[PDB]
Design a protein around this motif. Sequence first.
Motif, short mmCIF file in Angstrom:
data_model
loop_
_atom_site.label_atom_id
_atom_site.label_comp_id
_atom_site.label_asym_id
_atom_site.label_seq_id
_atom_site.Cartn_x
_atom_site.Cartn_y
_atom_site.Cartn_z
N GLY A 181 -17.71 82.90 -48.83
CA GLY A 181 -16.42 82.42 -49.46
C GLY A 181 -15.50 80.80 -48.60
O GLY A 181 -14.37 80.37 -48.75
N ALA A 182 -16.25 79.79 -48.18
CA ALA A 182 -16.01 78.41 -47.63
C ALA A 182 -16.14 77.67 -48.83
O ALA A 182 -15.36 76.42 -48.50
CB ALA A 182 -17.15 78.31 -46.66
N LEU A 183 -16.56 78.02 -49.47
CA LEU A 183 -16.14 77.42 -51.06
C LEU A 183 -16.25 77.58 -52.57
O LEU A 183 -16.74 79.09 -52.23
CB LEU A 183 -18.05 76.44 -51.23
N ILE A 184 -15.99 76.95 -53.01
CA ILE A 184 -16.01 77.44 -54.88
C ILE A 184 -16.81 76.93 -55.47
O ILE A 184 -17.01 76.45 -55.15
CB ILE A 184 -14.35 77.80 -55.25
N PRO A 198 -12.20 74.64 -51.04
CA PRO A 198 -10.12 74.95 -51.55
C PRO A 198 -9.76 74.66 -51.14
O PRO A 198 -8.78 74.68 -51.30
CB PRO A 198 -10.43 76.60 -51.98
N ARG A 199 -9.40 75.11 -49.73
CA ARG A 199 -8.39 74.87 -48.34
C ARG A 199 -7.74 73.73 -47.91
O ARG A 199 -6.28 73.17 -47.83
CB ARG A 199 -9.37 75.44 -46.81
N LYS A 200 -8.10 72.40 -48.43
CA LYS A 200 -7.82 70.77 -48.19
C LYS A 200 -8.39 70.61 -50.10
O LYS A 200 -8.06 69.22 -50.45
CB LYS A 200 -9.49 70.17 -47.54
N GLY A 201 -9.48 70.94 -51.12
CA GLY A 201 -9.11 70.46 -52.34
C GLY A 201 -11.24 69.86 -52.09
O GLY A 201 -11.08 68.86 -53.23
N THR A 202 -11.35 70.24 -50.97
CA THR A 202 -12.73 68.45 -50.92
C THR A 202 -13.79 68.98 -52.06
O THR A 202 -14.41 70.20 -52.03
CB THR A 202 -13.40 68.34 -49.44
N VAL A 203 -13.45 68.13 -52.74
CA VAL A 203 -15.51 68.17 -53.62
C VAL A 203 -16.44 67.63 -52.88
O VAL A 203 -16.91 66.44 -52.81
CB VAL A 203 -14.59 67.41 -55.10
N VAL A 204 -17.27 68.82 -52.88
CA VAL A 204 -18.10 68.29 -51.62
C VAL A 204 -19.70 67.64 -52.57
O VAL A 204 -20.75 67.41 -51.57
CB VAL A 204 -18.95 68.72 -50.54
N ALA A 205 -19.33 69.04 -53.55
CA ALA A 205 -20.70 68.14 -54.67
C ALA A 205 -20.67 68.04 -56.46
O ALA A 205 -19.34 68.91 -56.14
CB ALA A 205 -22.20 68.61 -54.26
N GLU A 206 -20.93 67.65 -57.01
CA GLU A 206 -20.92 67.61 -58.74
C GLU A 206 -21.79 67.23 -59.47
O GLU A 206 -22.44 66.24 -58.95
CB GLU A 206 -19.33 66.65 -58.75
N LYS A 207 -21.97 68.04 -60.60
CA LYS A 207 -22.61 67.55 -61.75
C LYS A 207 -22.04 67.38 -62.32
O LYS A 207 -21.64 68.00 -62.69
CB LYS A 207 -23.86 68.27 -61.70
N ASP A 208 -22.15 65.80 -63.15
CA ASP A 208 -21.63 65.69 -63.96
C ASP A 208 -22.66 65.96 -65.56
O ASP A 208 -24.52 65.74 -65.27
CB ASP A 208 -21.72 64.50 -64.18
N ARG A 209 -22.03 66.77 -66.85
CA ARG A 209 -22.77 67.16 -67.87
C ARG A 209 -24.48 67.34 -67.21
O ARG A 209 -25.67 67.33 -67.97
CB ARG A 209 -23.61 66.04 -68.74
#
Length: 395
Positions: A181-184, A198-209
């Motif tokens: 539960g450290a990430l969503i 989610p506590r700070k809202g940091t986007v640590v990884a992202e996949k576009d499409r």
Amino acid sequence: SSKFRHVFGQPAKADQCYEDVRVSQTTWDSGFCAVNPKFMALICEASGGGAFLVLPLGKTGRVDKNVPLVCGHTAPVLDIAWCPHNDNVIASGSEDCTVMVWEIPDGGLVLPLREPVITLEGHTKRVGIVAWHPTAQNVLLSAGCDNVILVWDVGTGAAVLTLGPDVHPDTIYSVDWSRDGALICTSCRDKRVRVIEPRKGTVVAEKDRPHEGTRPVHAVFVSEGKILTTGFSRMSERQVALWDTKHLEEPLSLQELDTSSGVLLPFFDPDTNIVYLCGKGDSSIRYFEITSEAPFLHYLSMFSSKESQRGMGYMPKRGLEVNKCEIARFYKLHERKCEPIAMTVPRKSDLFQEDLYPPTAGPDPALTAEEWLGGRDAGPLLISLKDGYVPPKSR
């Protein structure tokens, strides 16, 4: 062959299903059925408010038309989820824009339940995703059609975190908590899958499409550092993909399934590394195994049937018949029926099968809400499924 190659589905007999239930006809991509070791719940068709049914698991057979329901909501219920840390507590999200948290008596309802323990008010559009935190006491996430994610402390009723429409500018298809539960992990109609602290809202990884199609994508965390998506090709071929969150340029594996319009909902089991795939409208449940052996995502088999599912619940490990090598149990909604389907490993032993049943996430929280909000992380407190191990009492 995988030790799971010959896993097979077995539907319960009529006397062990729940019949004549007014299953919700609302068009929505949630499970509509949520079950735990004590209770079966499903969302009802209600024209003057919102309602869902809760029954003790043992109360099988035809359900009386006048059965007491959980009400309170003033518009249709869209999602229900049992608290992993209390088999008597369930949250519902509704078209009335609220999330309500309910306590169910042992023995089930005697009268309609109209007043929740707490009502969480903050979304400005319908709420179709609720998800309890896996390890922190009383922490609950909701996501609404306002494209806002709220995280609540149900112990105080407070909204404690907010991720606004700057984070998800379009419909949120899915949200999944990581193991600790450290990430969503969220999947958005803007075609981005995001891994967020989610506590700070940091986007640590992202996949576009991750997929080329115009239909919804769902995403879940799987084995450590990996996520899985379901989605569609440009030409509406359904697909499942396994991703390394550290190297998102291409999937570890992308598998074409069939050509349907039905959204496949993934159910990942960390204890076996199996992922099951079921979509509304389908009559089948596919399963894959995730290994560290390339090609990483391995097809096992499929449960087939003659009936299309209108919803699907999934039994926590503590509810399974360990002595019968049951490794999952689905609760399939179809027409006016809720039908348990055991998923079984064919074995023959009188002994506890340790390799099938490693210690599993238990009902006692690993952190308080305030500890987690203050930045502590912790994995779930584990229990043994072996006969004789008494699970912790709920708080």
